Amino acid sequence: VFLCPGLLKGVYQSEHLFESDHQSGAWCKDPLQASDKIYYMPWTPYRTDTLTEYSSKDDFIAGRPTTTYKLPHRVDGTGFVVYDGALFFNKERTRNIVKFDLRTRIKSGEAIIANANYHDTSPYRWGGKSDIDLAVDENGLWVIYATEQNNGKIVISQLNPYTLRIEGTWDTAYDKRSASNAFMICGILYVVKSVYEDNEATGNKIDYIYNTDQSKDSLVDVPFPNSYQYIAAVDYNPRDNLLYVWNNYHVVKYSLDFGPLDSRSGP
């Protein structure tokens, strides 16, 4: 579907929005909606059950909301996405992804993510029940989770955004709890490693990448910004080619520069 912009090489913070009253959460747009709507779901342990929607950045800053989406179940972690007017999220204390149709207010589907670890079992570095991360890119819908077969090691899956079914599963040899956050571009996993709040300079960059197509994986050093020392959620947009990062209360957009897309083989 959406056209691949190339291989990500340079991440630069270009826009600085407001500061949240929550250290964690997620904020994103819909890359299938021609409207410039904004969806914001701040993390509140065992109390996250509402998704807020905003019409513009101006309304998003001033805290002027368009509408509120009360969800029929509690949400676990900052994984959520919004794709073709339906939000996808990790239903609390389950390995299920729930498709919820916004502006119809109905549960259209529920997908059981086979052998996935949930509820602060295989999360990101900060935990916060961020075990399963939904992802939207040029190839569509994704699920960045982890299995105990791998034992911590990230497991990525293609997920039909209309029928909610696993269209492939790729095992990665890189720990999830080590990962501060992860994302997808052209079906390629970019895994973010950042320092948090002993708290030494472990590193502030994407150190690992797994390619869905070809199943090959390599080590990297893409300089990722962590000025606020607590990366809460990173969500890529294929419509505007931007990262919709949440960081230690700071709601911010990160711009990208793309290099040539290459893939080598030898099985």
Partner 1 sequence: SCPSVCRCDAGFIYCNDRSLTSIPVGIPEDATTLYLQNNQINNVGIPSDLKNLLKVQRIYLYHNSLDEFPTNLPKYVKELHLQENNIRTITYDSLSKIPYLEELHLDDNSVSAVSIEEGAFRDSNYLRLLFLSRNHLSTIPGGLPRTIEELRLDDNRISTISSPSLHGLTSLKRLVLDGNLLNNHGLGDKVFFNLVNLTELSLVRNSLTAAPVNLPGTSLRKLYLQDNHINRVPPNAFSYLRQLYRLDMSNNNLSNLPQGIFDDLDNITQLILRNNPWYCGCKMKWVRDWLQSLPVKVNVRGLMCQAPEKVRGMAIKDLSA
Question: Where do contacts with partner 1 occur on this chain (CB under 8 A)?
Answer: 46, 93, 115, 117, 119-121, 148, 151-152, 175, 177
Neighbours of 179 (CB within 10 A): 28
* Separation in Å, CA 211 to CA 6, 92, 138, 168: 13, 29, 14, 13
Please tell me whether residue 235 binds Ca ion under the rule CB under 5 A: yes
Span from 22-30, 118-126, 127-135, 201-209 in contact with Ca ion (CB under 5 A): 127-135
Name which of partner 1, Ca ion, none residue 235 binds, using a CB cut-off of 5 to 8 Å depending on partner kind. Ca ion
| Smaller CB separation from Ca ion, 76 or 235 | 235
Span from 66-74, 99-107, 208-216, 230-238 in contact with Ca ion (CB under 5 A): 230-238
62 annotated as ligand-binding: no
With contact defined as beta carbons under 8 Å apart, do 191 and 182 qualify? yes
181 annotated as ligand-binding: yes
133 annotated as ligand-binding: yes
234 annotated as ligand-binding: yes
Nearest-approach distance from CB 100 to partner 1, in angstroms: 19
The site for Ca ion (CB under 5 A) is made up of 135, 183, 234-235
Binding residues for Ca(2+): 133, 181-182, 234
